[PDB]
Amino acid sequence: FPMMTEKGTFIINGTERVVVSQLVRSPGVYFDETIDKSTEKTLHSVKVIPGRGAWLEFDVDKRDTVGVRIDRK
Amino acid sequence: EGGPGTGKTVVALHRVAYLLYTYRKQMERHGVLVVGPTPAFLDHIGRVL
Secondary structure, eight states: OOOBOTTSOEEETTEEEOOOOOOOOOSEEEEEEEEETTTTEEEEEEEEEOSSSOOEEEEEOTTSOEEEEETTO | OOOTTSOHHHHHHHHHHHHHHHTHHHHTTTOOOOOOSSHHHHHHHHHHO
16 A cells, blocks of 8 residues: 655655645535526525435426426436 | 405505515515506506505
8 A cells, every 4th residue: 555755745656746635515415596597587496416426406496386306307 | 355445455555565675585576466457447556556
């Protein structure tokens, strides 16, 4: 198992390398608000975004009804 | 609902104005639908709204 040196680097094939920390969106439930261009009405939606798995979205559309999208279907 | 001569129409329009100010966030983009028996009555509403 490659091991980190005291300097925070990995010696891979004698070459000194570094692994950079990656900025990513955290999994969770995210609520959003947008404007319906067709009516200028205010619409709300929410996405449940996991680390692995299908997506689950809910939204209130311009005709005032609540709907769900499962697995982007 | 009230007998004639009680000014129910103006009271209702005042109620509508109060509702549309209080909840303007939830209604201003949707508007109001005013239904009347005759075009002349709707002109009256347009005058007193």
